[PDB]
Amino acid sequence: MLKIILPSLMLLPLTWLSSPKKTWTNVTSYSFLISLTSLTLLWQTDENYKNFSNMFSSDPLSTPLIILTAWLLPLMLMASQNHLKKDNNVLQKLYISMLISLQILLIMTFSATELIMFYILFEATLIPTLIIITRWGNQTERLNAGIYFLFYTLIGSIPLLIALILIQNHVGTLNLMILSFTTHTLDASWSNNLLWLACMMAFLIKMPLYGVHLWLPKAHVEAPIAGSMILAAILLKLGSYGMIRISIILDPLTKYMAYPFILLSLWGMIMTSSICLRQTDLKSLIAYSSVSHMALVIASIMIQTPWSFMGATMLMIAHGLTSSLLFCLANSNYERIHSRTMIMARGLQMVFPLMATWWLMASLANLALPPSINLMGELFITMSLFSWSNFTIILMGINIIITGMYSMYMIITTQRGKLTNHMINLQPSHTRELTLMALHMIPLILLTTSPKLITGLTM
Amino acid sequence: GWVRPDLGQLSKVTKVKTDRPLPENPYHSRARPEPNPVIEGDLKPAKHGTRFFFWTV
Ligand SMILES: CCCCCCCCCCCCCCCCCC(=O)OC[C@H](COP(=O)([O-])OCC[N+](C)(C)C)OC(=O)CCCCCCCCCCCCCCCCC
Numbered sequence: 323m324l325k326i327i328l329p330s331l332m333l334l335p336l337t338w339l340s341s342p343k344k345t346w347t348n349v350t351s352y353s354f355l356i357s358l359t360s361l362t363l364l365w366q367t368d369e370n371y372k373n374f375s376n377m378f379s380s381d382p383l384s385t386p387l388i389i390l391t392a393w394l395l396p397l398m399l400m401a402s403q404n405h406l407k408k409d410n411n412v413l414q415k416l417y418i419s420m421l422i423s424l425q426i427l428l429i430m431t432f433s434a435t436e437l438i439m440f441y442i443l444f445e446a447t448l449i450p451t452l453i454i455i456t457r458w459g460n461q462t463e464r465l466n467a468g469i470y471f472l473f474y475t476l477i478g479s480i481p482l483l484i485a486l487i488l489i490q491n492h493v494g495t496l497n498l499m500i501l502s503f504t505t506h507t508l509d510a511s512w513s514n515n516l517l518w519l520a521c522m523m524a525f526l527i528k529m530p531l532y533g534v535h536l537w538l539p540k541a542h543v544e545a546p547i548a549g550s551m552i553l554a555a556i557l558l559k560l561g562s563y564g565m566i567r568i569s570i571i572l573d574p575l576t577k578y579m580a581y582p583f584i585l586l587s588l589w590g591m592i593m594t595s596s597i598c599l600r601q602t603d604l605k606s607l608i609a610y611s612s613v614s615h616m617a618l619v620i621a622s623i624m625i626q627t628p629w630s631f632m633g634a635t636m637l638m639i640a641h642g643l644t645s646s647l648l649f650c651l652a653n654s655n656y657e658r659i660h661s662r663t664m665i666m667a668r669g670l671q672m673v674f675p676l677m678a679t680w681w682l683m684a685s686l687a688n689l690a691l692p693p694s695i696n697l698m699g700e701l702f703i704t705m706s707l708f709s710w711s712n713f714t715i716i717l718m719g720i721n722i723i724i725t726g727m728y729s730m731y732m733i734i735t736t737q738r739g740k741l742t743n744h745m746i747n748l749q750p751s752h753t754r755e756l757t758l759m760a761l762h763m764i765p766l767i768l769l770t771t772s773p774k775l776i777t778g779l780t781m
Numbered sequence: 782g783w784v785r786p787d788l789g790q791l792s793k794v795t796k797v798k799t800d801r802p803l804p805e806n807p808y809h810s811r812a813r814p815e816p817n818p819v820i821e822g823d824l825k826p827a828k829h830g831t832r833f834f835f836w837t838v
Pocket residue numbers: 474477478479480481484485488513514516517519520523527
């Protein structure tokens with residue numbers, strides 16, 4: 323794991339020592355090489371998990387998240403290159419440093435084998451996202467968005483810290499593999515119910531429920547493109563990863579203690595898809611779509627079926643890729659027009675043909691299309707939920723119908739129709755942003771071609 | 782035939798001889814309970830380092 327962490331650590335001296343005319347080139351190229359290096363722990367021949375160190379470990383669950391983070395860092399650099407062109411060199415290098423530190427801390431978080439170290443790196447990732455959102459956001463409400471994001475996360479995470487220290491004082495180790503082996507059943511008391519709530523609510527805040535979710539649209543609207551990318555593609559999945567990790571020591575009482583959150587997830591995915599239907603902001607629409615998909619992930623992890631876990635992992639990776647792609651496309655239009663109003667730019671398929679192709683493919687990934695890991699994850703989540711109770715299929719069907727409706731509504735209202743001819747400042751395309759869309763979409767095709775990698779722990 | 786003592790003669794120690802036995806336990810002292818069993822041995826290093834959470838060393 324150190325062979326991946328240390329080059330990413332040395333990215334920062336490269337960033338601060340590179341010439342100002344070569345900084346973006348050097349950091350982007352070496353971060354691509356670091357992702358290529360991070361591809362090496364897919365070499366999983368045996369069923370044994372790759373335990374490199376006494377503190378670092380690999381997993382069929384942790385590996386796709388690490389590879390996605392290492393892949394997404396150069397994509398964030400490419401996306402954030404254009405909107406920092408009229409900026410001080412020190413500020414540009416500081417922004418690149420924030421992105422690189424996010425990548426380092428997230429790789430360490432996913433590869434950490436101890437829950438307390440996972441918590442430390444969890445809040446360590448909480449810091450530079452706040453700095454990015456507040457310092458480089460565009461509108462006034464970035465400060466409110468940062469406050470909401472930070473303190474939703476912290477009020478979630480403090481009972482998680484209390485619960486982790488309780489578990490460490492009880493069993494003596496707080497190591498994931500020792501807990502997984504000598505896990506102990508809980509005697510179903512009110513203290514154990516509160517312990518379950520304390521160790522769940524941090525991750526239930528971090529990936530959005532129907533309740534606490536109000537920080538996500540604010541942060542996504544007010545964040546720059548790299549911040550939206552890192553949030554919607556890694557941090558919600560970080561909450562899901564934490565839930566999958568910590569659910570193993572709560573064996574007997576999850577089967578009744580998970581009831582309110584399953585209902586909250588299903589009805590909330592319906593309501594957030596409805597908001598996507600009647601939403602006037604493109605980034606808000608993508609954010610609420612992310613809430614709906616993560617609600618599906620919450621329901622699968624709560625019902626704790628092998629099909630549910632596999633579908634949860636597939637939906638995690640697929641949703642990260644397609645949400646980053648949608649955010650990048652919306653950011654390209656926003657860099658053209660300097661407004662996120664959805665109804666204002668309408669006939670963009672006329673002037674941007676292949677960007678419209680990327681829009682069409684991104685929306686076909688957003689809805690569940692059967693040659694895609696999106697439909698793979700959503701379909702196996704549906705199968706596990708219907709096994710859990712047959713009446714969940716009604717909520718699933720309503721969610722799928724509204725999902726198709728808001729995705730095709732997005733395509734029709736922002737690409738098709740008569741072109742708003744008054745918008746003179748529609749530059750043709752940047753090879754950079756077309757490359758950005760291609761680097762989002764081609765991994766979706768490859769993971770569709772071989773979905774055994776995205777299958778998680780259970781099979 | 783008595784001689785009055787000098788200026789500094791009555792104010793010194795005398796070393797009087799007696800046959801009364803010396804009291805072996807003045808103050809009627811109690812058992813004086815034994816101290817703690819001090820641990821002896823070679824100072825080996827701490828096992829597996831500090832054992833503070835995830836710190837290996
Ligand atoms: C962001 C989400 C916030 C809301 C949900 C938070 C969790 C709600 C349910 C848990 C109770 C509150 C958090 C306790 C954290 C520690 C849990 C734990 O270790 O439980 C086992 C312990 C019990 O320890 P034990 O299990 O060792 O008990 C001994 C048991 N025998 C003898 C059988 C071995 O629970 C507690 O000690 C709970 C005491 C809580 C006192 C403080 C309450 C503060 C107010 C509550 C809400 C706080 C968050 C919201 C603040 C406002 C936000 C707007």
